[PDB]
């Protein structure tokens, strides 16, 4: 499914680290004046037109580069663009709502109506451009047994290290909101997590913890986990809700590799129903992945 | 006791800032330096050294720092922003640092409530009596002024870091809204602004 495509970096932009999807290079007309400046990165599939390439290179406002990627994942596309322009970080993903470019690459990764860029709130929670990690509570951080418990109390230390370095903490466990909330309360994690996934929740013990799963779209022509194999789109949307419109890389840590929708990194852990000292090794793996990303963009 | 140890650490950080000031080797106190408009070079050097000191603290592993910066000491009201005595603009690739010298002078000249307030301290009359029977300096006001300037430049340096890391757009947006750094430490620990809290209430 190797597909050729073009990417352009604006040589003088107002909004940085933001990418816009176009069905073709000609879509720039839809931006016209004082809109292109808000998308310093432009991505669009390539139609093998040398005259189009000539036009693009003549467009001195843009630095062009061509790369190929499978037509099924933002991961390869984003890796290619980020290595091309040496940008470890990505801004909010924008699309031309007037002319939605239907690329199978996306299929529920993330997006935004282009015109909403200016409305974005730059202020965020963590200084710099933190990483993001999503944890599937069930048997990943706790014990699958009924009387759930932290499989390895080193979980607290690992989360504190994540926070100290700077990295958004997200939970997505495919259980009842009440189940996950009470699991947090029992294992005394609670405040560790920036985002929680399973009007948010009201029990007189919590104010707002589980953003209501209002977004429903079934599947994008893929037979898999009934609910979903997790949702980069939903998690990044909640990041933006939490004022996080930038991130360095995203890692999904869970007890089930099947979900693994599209994440810059993934970590699998045992479906262990009883406590065991292994989360230190899992934390070692996660920090190794983070360091690997840091190596990819060490220069 | 413990809190006293953190107090000692904070005072040590202030003392390090004092070492930086001595390295600068200014004849006059910062109050007089700021009062003297002609000392534009001294003011710029003070600001730059404070910024580098804060950068080293905020990034202990990083010793590098911008070794050249355009500076402009502003005096007119229209050349200053309330609540941001220090600003970091860009003149099309040129990094300009604007300074509100009148505001700095005003803050420094403000009388401090050193004696006026009474606060809890290590106070044991028995120890005092036992001691009695067994038997270049900085004032509290100067220390307060110096802390005020350090914290001002800390705010300015945080805005500058937003500017460099994110860009001029986000720097302006931060100037408008400061909510980005309610969390602060999330590096930051070495910044005194992360050591206390200040609030305003309707009354």
């Amino acid at each position: 499914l190797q597909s050729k495509w073009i990417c352009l970096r604006l040589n003088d932009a107002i909004i940085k680290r933001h990418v816009l999807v176009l069905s073709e290079y000609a879509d720039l007309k839809y931006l016209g004046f004082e809109k292109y400046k808000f998308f310093e990165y432009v991505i669009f599939q390539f139609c093998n037109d040398p005259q189009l390439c000539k036009i693009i290179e003549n467009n001195y406002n843009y630095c062009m580069q061509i790369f190929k990627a499978p037509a099924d994942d933002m991961r390869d596309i984003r890796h290619n663009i980020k290595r091309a322009f040496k940008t470890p970080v990505l801004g909010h993903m924008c699309v031309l709502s007037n002319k939605p470019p239907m690329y199978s690459f996306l299929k529920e990764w993330f997006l935004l109506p282009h015109y909403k860029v200016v409305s974005l709130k730059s202020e965020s929670l963590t200084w710099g451009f933190p990483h993001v990690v999503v944890f599937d509570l069930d048997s990943t951080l706790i014990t699958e047994e009924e009387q759930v418990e932290i499989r390895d109390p080193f979980v607290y230390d690992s989360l504190q290290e994540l926070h100290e370095m700077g990295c958004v903490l997200v939970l997505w466990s495919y259980g009842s909101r009440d189940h996950v909330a009470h699991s947090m309360r029992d294992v005394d994690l609670e405040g560790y997590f920036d985002i929680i996934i399973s009007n948010a929740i009201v029990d007189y013990n919590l104010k707002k913890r589980f953003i209501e799963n209002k977004f429903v779209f079934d599947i994008h022509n893929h037979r898999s986990d009934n609910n979903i194999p997790k949702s980069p789109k939903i998690v990044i949307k909640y990041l933006s809700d939490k004022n996080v419109n930038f991130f360095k890389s995203i890692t999904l840590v869970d007890d089930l590799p099947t979900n693994n929708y599209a994440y810059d990194f993934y970590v699998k852990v045992k479906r262990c129903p009883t406590p065991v000292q292994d989360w230190e090794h899992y934390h070692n793996e996660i920090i190794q992945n983070i360091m690997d990303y840091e190596q990819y963009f060490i220069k | 006791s413990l809190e006293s140890y953190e107090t000692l650490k904070i005072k040590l950080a202030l003392s390090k800032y004092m070492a930086m000031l001595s390295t600068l080797e200014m004849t006059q106190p910062l109050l007089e330096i700021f009062r003297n408009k002609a000392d534009t070079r001294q003011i710029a050097a003070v600001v730059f050294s404070t910024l580098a000191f804060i950068h080293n603290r905020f990034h202990p592993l990083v010793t590098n720092f911008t070794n050249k910066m355009e500076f402009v000491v502003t005096e007119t009201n229209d050349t200053s922003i309330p609540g941001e005595p220090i600003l970091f603009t860009e003149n099309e690739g040129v990094l300009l640092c604007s300074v509100d010298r009148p505001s700095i002078v005003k803050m420094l000249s403000r009388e401090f409530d050193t004696e006026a307030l009474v606060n809890f301290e290590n106070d044991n009359c028995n120890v005092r009596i036992a001691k009695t029977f067994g038997a270049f300096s900085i004032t509290e006001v100067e220390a307060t002024q110096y802390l005020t300037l350090l914290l001002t430049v800390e705010h300015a340096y945080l805005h500058y870091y937003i500017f460099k890391n994110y860009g001029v757009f986000e720097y302006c947006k931060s100037l408008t809204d400061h909510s980005l750094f309610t969390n602060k430490l999330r590096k930051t620990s070495n910044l005194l602004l992360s050591k206390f809290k200040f609030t305003i209430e309707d009354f």
Binding site: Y156, Q160, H163, E190, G191, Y192 | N77, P82, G83, H155, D177, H178, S179, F181, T182, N183, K184, L185, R186, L193, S194, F196, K197, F198, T199, I200, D202
Partner: peptide
């Protein structure tokens, strides 16, 4: 002096410190 409105909550945010859980 500038006759500009003041954002009390934003000033509080300037000097706002979050507290961790440990």
């Amino acid at each position: 002096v500038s006759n500009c409105k003041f954002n009390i909550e934003d000033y509080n945010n300037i000097f706002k410190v979050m507290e961790n859980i440990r």
